[PDB]
Design a protein around this ligand. Structure first.
Ligand SMILES: *[C@@H]1O[C@H](CO)[C@@H](O)[C@H](O)[C@H]1NC(C)=O
Lengths: 200, 179
């Protein structure tokens, strides 16, 4: 696992000053197309950047102009950066392909009634899906075997920060006694979509 | 499509720095400055790979240098505080007497220095908690998580108290079992 090195800039109740840089590796169709993007962010504004597509350092604001001229003068730095797509971006991908790119965690589905307003008749139905990875997921609501696509309000993809996601897909309905509702979840972790039912 | 980000920062005059790797918005690991060692987000990752924390500490020293260079160039322009946007949610459906986790999602704030204290009932809570270091964002703000494993009960109420220089009063987010 490699970390990319960095040179120096040009020059030399309390207030706060923030500086940060980010090395972004972008993978398209797997390793086929890789793109490296370095950013230098003083406070909240980006000032200078290096794009693998352009191959040079370019300034984003007035602050980044000295660094762009300075760092482009260093030929060894540019020749090292242009080749960093393979030596750095592609390297870490191979190191982390097994447990991140090829990581699959099965979701846990629960269905339980709820009330959108204190109407006290449990008009709303909740399908709770939590603990899954990756985020790509499809949750559908079925009433008596028929797909219900109108009146479905949901929560977006929620990130728990522990490499697991959660989401809620809700159905506003009038629960007639004797009807069966089905929540169907389709996820890369499972070959067959999970189904959970709730009987009035 | 996937994105691996190597994000580091340095902040003055607090002299607070951080080094971490982010994958699709989830932290892979961060380097602990005080203990000078690598801290993996999940322990399972440590068996498959490794990382030399010395190379991380070398970049941080440069960040301090470039921050001092960029500050003078900018005519000592200070940063504009951005108040966070807190959200408290549970880790799973809430059943009485069933162990669960509480999450406090701090987001959209800068600079990356906040102080978070859990406030169950009216009494603070210090046990069982964990957190994550500041995670990077596209707009260059920050993200943070604070957890609290607890035991649900009808008569227990929780609060997440967040302190940030962009706020006039500490933001209080509440959670209680409603049924
Ligand atoms: C914790 O955060 C608060 C928020 O402004 C700040 O006043 C304080 O200096 C921070 N550090 C502490 C309490 O050590």
């Amino acid at each position: 696992w490699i970390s990319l090195w960095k040179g120096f800039s040009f020059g030399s109740t309390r207030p706060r000053f923030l500086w940060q840089l980010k090395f972004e590796c972008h993978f398209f169709n797997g390793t086929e197309r890789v793109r490296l993007l370095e950013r230098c962010i003083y406070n909240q504004e980006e000032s200078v950047r290096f794009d693998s597509d352009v191959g040079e350092y370019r300034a984003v604001t007035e602050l980044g102009r000295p660094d762009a001229e300075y760092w482009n003068s260093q030929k060894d730095l540019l020749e090292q950066r242009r080749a960093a797509v393979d030596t750095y971006c592609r390297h870490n991908y191979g190191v982390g392909e097994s447990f991140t790119v090829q990581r699959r965690v099965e979701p846990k589905v629960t269905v339980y009634p709820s009330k959108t307003q204190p109407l006290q008749h449990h008009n709303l139905l909740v399908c709770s899906v939590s603990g899954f990875y990756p985020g790509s997921i499809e949750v559908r609501w079925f009433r008596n075997g028929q797909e219900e696509k109108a009146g479905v309000v949901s929560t977006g993809l929620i990130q728990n920060g522990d490499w697991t996601f959660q989401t809620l897909v809700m159905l506003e309905t009038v629960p007639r006694s004797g009807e069966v509702y089905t929540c169907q979840v389709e996820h890369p972790s499972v070959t067959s979509p999970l189904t959970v039912e709730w009987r009035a | 499509e996937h994105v691996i980000i190597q994000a580091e920062f340095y902040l003055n005059p607090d002299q607070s720095g951080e080094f971490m790797f982010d994958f699709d918005g989830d932290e892979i690991f961060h380097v602990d400055m005080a203990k000078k060692e690598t801290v993996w987000r999940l322990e399972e990752f440590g068996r498959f790979a490794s990382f030399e924390a010395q190379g991380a500490l070398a970049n941080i020293a440069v960040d301090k240098a470039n921050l001092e260079i960029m500050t003078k160039r900018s005519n000592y322009t200070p940063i504009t505080n951005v108040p966070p946007e807190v959200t408290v949610l549970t880790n799973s459906p809430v059943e009485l007497r069933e162990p669960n986790v509480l999450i406090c999602f701090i987001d959209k704030f800068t600079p990356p220095v906040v102080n978070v204290t859990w406030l169950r009932n009216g009494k603070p809570v210090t046990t069982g908690v964990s957190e994550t270091v500041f995670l990077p964002r596209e707009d260059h703000l920050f993200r943070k998580f604070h957890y609290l494993p607890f035991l649900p009960s009808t008569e227990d109420v929780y609060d997440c108290r967040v302190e940030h220089w962009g706020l006039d009063e500490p933001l209080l987010k509440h959670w209680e079992f409603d049924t």
